[PDB]
Design a protein around this ligand. Structure first.
Ligand code: FES
Ligand SMILES: [Mg+2]
Lengths: 100, 215, 225, 135, 26, 57
């Protein structure tokens, strides 16, 4: 009775989420460079969000935040390219901080 | 020490430079081989010829091909390939046939260790395309063991000298199929008009089948 | 007289067992799934030679079949462990700068080598000139990322083959595995995936080196008496 | 004198052949390991070709029966104001809770779709779930 | 065989095609 | 290469492999066949492969 991969994939939250556009997710800030926040939200790629002007000091490494997802991976095929160009990061909008 | 080197082409190439004008260099093609299946070729470039020789022969030993030989004297099957615009048609031959091939092919075959083969070169006769095509064709040949393993059948050799005796040359290492190979009443294989014209006694050339020195 | 017994009891004995180092206990399809190893790039980035390893596309995002990853990873870890047991030089290569520090530390901790920096032309094919005529090259190159920073295959993949060095490589859905000796389909981007790979190879290498000392020590004690 | 023709065969085939020919005096340290535990595919160079005409990749889209319920749920009720926590491997969203109740009621013999969807919303409201219709 | 395997069907999340402001008007 | 499909048909070896040598009585042989239909497939291959051998002999 060993769970199969097909079963793990069916019941994974990322599978159950469906399309990512306009989905609220919880992220975690793992790296900060000046006012650029690198936030992981459980996907393949992190998103990069600018530090909000209000309560900017509350956003630190490890801070959990609320995001509105737009794309799990930013990619596009441009004129003459044989494959899609990827920036290796997700597109998301930082809404604020998650609190209990 | 076991490898011998042979020159295939020595060419004076020229480039134009702003200051010195027409500048002279040497392009050399050499082939190396030990006579036991291991052989390779390399281009050499230099201003002096002896430096081109050194570069070509020393580089070629790092780019060796291994060439499979049937009974260590000929190729496993007829090889017909085109490399760019150079066509090379090679035929498996029995012992004593010798190397009846383009002089450059003779040189390369002695380095590989092939004693009996016929080859015909058609189209562009370029030494580098001929050498590169030759090694491609010879490297990509299927041995009898590979054929037996691929089809899970015995490879049986029939010789007119040995009459109807069936000589198994290769047997599959894995299980042996029980279903005979389908016998297509008429094969849809492409034929070369030169081979057909010759087998019908229609190829009349004063230059074919001429007496030549042992090669 | 004594060499044939040495090579037979030490070098040839591990090669008679399917899992001599028990590397299957190091991972599971669940452990790989939790590390997000199944997550691949978007379908528009798919490399043709990766289709056989792709479970499917979930809303234009390719999913890597972890059933295959588990079998490929088993072979790669097993090969890596055997090469460490034989005291081979293992070189980790990756240009993903997010993990350069992590990978360089993993190599130092296991007693191996890392090259995460810009790869200069001829490090492998011209090593004797760059390092010296007696320089020993790596016996195994492990790619944690097979692509360079312009999304092309790392030059060492081609040059490792030229020098007849076997390569282990994590190959994402946009990578070319044709020349990688032991490819492992898996996510190369997520920190959880990359960290897992470093733990597995580090653990495989560390166990194999400890096993080599155990066997040698026993072979010597028994030899005297 | 290892061959550098990386596009001709594999490191194993090139090494095995040169060992037979006597070019390589000793086998490399990795050869015996490769022979005992070879990879699933022999690493031979191949040139990738673009597809033409009617050739298509064999990758299929991953869909599930519940995806139809999720598409309707998102249309009717939108994405829940509750935030997804993709770090928790056992996370259940409002949509997943709707899908599980929708599946339970279907197994009770109900087969109509428009009726099986309205009864599911009522059950959750009874349990205290907030379902704000988008329109 | 296995119940958790994916099933073949059409995209359920596919958005309706966009229309011009005059679509369906004379 | 030799033009056409099954260029073996245009070789003297193939044409001499016909085993049908008609008796002196036979003066004319008409072949009525259909270009399409699964039941006329053998007659099409007969026209394609064997009519040349019959005429040669
Ligand atoms: S979109 Fe213009 S007529 Fe329909
Ligand atoms: Mg990747």
């Amino acid at each position: 009775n060993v769970e199969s991969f097909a079963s793990m994939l069916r019941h994974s939250p990322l599978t159950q989420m469906g399309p990512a556009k306009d989905k609220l997710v919880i992220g975690r800030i793992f790296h900060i460079v000046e006012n650029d926040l690198y936030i992981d939200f459980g996907g393949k790629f992190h998103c990069v969000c600018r530090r909000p002007e209000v309560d900017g000091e509350k956003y630190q490494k490890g801070t959990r935040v609320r995001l509105r997802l737009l794309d799990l991976e930013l990619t596009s095929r441009f004129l003459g390219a044989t494959t899609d160009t990827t920036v290796l990061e997700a597109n998301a909008v930082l809404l604020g901080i998650q609190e209990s | 020490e076991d490898f011998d080197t042979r020159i295939l082409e020595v060419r004076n190439v020229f480039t134009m430079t702003a200051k010195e004008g027409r500048k002279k260099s040497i392009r050399v093609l050499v082939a190396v081989g030990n006579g036991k299946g291991a052989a390779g070729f390399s281009i050499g470039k230099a201003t002096d010829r002896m430096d081109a020789f050194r570069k070509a022969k020393n580089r070629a030993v790092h780019h060796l091909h291994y060439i499979e030989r049937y009974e260590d004297h000929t190729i496993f099957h007829d090889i017909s390939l085109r490399f760019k615009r150079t066509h090379i048609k090679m035929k498996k031959q029995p012992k004593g046939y010798g190397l009846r091939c383009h002089r450059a092919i003779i040189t390369i075959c002695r380095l590989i260790g092939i004693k009996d083969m016929y080859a015909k070169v058609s189209g562009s006769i370029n030494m580098l395309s001929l050498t590169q095509g030759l090694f491609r064709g010879l490297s990509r040949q299927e041995t009898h063991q590979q054929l037996a393993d691929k089809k899970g059948l015995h490879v049986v050799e029939i010789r007119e000298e040995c009459g109807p005796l069936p000589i198994v040359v290769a047997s599959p290492r894995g299980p042996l199929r029980k279903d005979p190979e389908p016998e297509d009443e008429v094969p849809d294989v492409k034929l070369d008009w030169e081979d057909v014209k010759t087998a019908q006694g229609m190829k009349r050339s004063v230059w074919s089948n001429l007496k030549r020195a042992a090669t | 007289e004594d060499s044939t017994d040495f090579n037979d009891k030490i070098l040839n004995e591990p090669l008679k067992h399917s899992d001599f180092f028990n590397v299957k206990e190091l991972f599971s399809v669940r452990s790989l799934f939790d590390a997000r190893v199944h997550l691949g790039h978007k379908a528009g980035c798919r490399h043709r030679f990766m289709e056989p390893y792709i479970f499917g596309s979930r809303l234009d995002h390719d999913i890597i079949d972890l059933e295959q990853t588990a079998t490929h990873l088993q072979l790669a870890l097993n090969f890596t462990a055997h090469m460490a047991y034989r005291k081979g030089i293992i070189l980790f290569i990756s240009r993903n700068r997010q993990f350069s520090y992590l990978i360089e530390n993993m190599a130092r901790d296991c007693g191996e080598y890392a090259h995460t920096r810009y790869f200069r032309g001829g490090m492998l094919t011209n090593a004797r000139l760059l390092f010296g005529p007696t320089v020993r090259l790596p016996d195994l190159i492990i790619f944690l990322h097979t692509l360079n920073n312009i999304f092309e295959p790392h030059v060492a993949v081609r040059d490792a083959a030229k020098m007849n060095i076997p390569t282990v490589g994590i190959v994402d859905t946009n990578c070319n595995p044709c020349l990688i000796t032991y490819p492992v389909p898996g996510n190369d981007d997520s920190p959880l995936a990359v960290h897992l790979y470093c733990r597995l190879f580090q653990t495989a290498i560390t166990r194999a080196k400890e096993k080599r000392q155990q066997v040698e020590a026993l072979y010597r004690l028994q030899g005297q008496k | 004198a290892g061959s550098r023709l990386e596009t001709v065969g594999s490191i194993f085939s090139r090494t095995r052949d040169l060992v037979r020919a006597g070019v390589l005096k000793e086998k490399p340290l990795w050869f015996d390991v490769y022979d005992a535990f070879p990879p699933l595919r022999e690493p031979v160079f191949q040139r990738p070709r673009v597809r033409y005409g009617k050739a298509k990749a064999p990758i299929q889209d991953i869909w599930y029966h519940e995806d139809r319920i999720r598409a309707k749920f998102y249309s009717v009720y939108g994405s829940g104001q509750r935030a997804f926590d993709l770090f928790n491997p056992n996370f259940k969203s409002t949509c997943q809770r709707f899908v599980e109740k929708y599946t339970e009621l279907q197994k009770l013999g109900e087969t109509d779709e428009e009726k099986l969807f309205v009864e599911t919303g009522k059950a959750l409201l009874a349990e205290g779930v907030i379902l704000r219709r988008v329109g | 065989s296995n119940e958790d395997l994916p099933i073949s069907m059409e995209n359920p999340y596919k958005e309706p095609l966009k229309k011009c402001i005059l679509c369906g008007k004379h | 290469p030799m033009k056409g499909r099954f260029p073996i048909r245009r070789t003297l070896q193939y044409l001499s492999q016909g085993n049908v040598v008609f008796k002196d009585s036979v003066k004319v042989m008409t072949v009525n066949y259909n270009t399409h239909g699964e039941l006329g497939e053998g007659a099409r291959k007969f026209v394609f492969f064997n009519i040349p051998q019959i005429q040669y002999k």
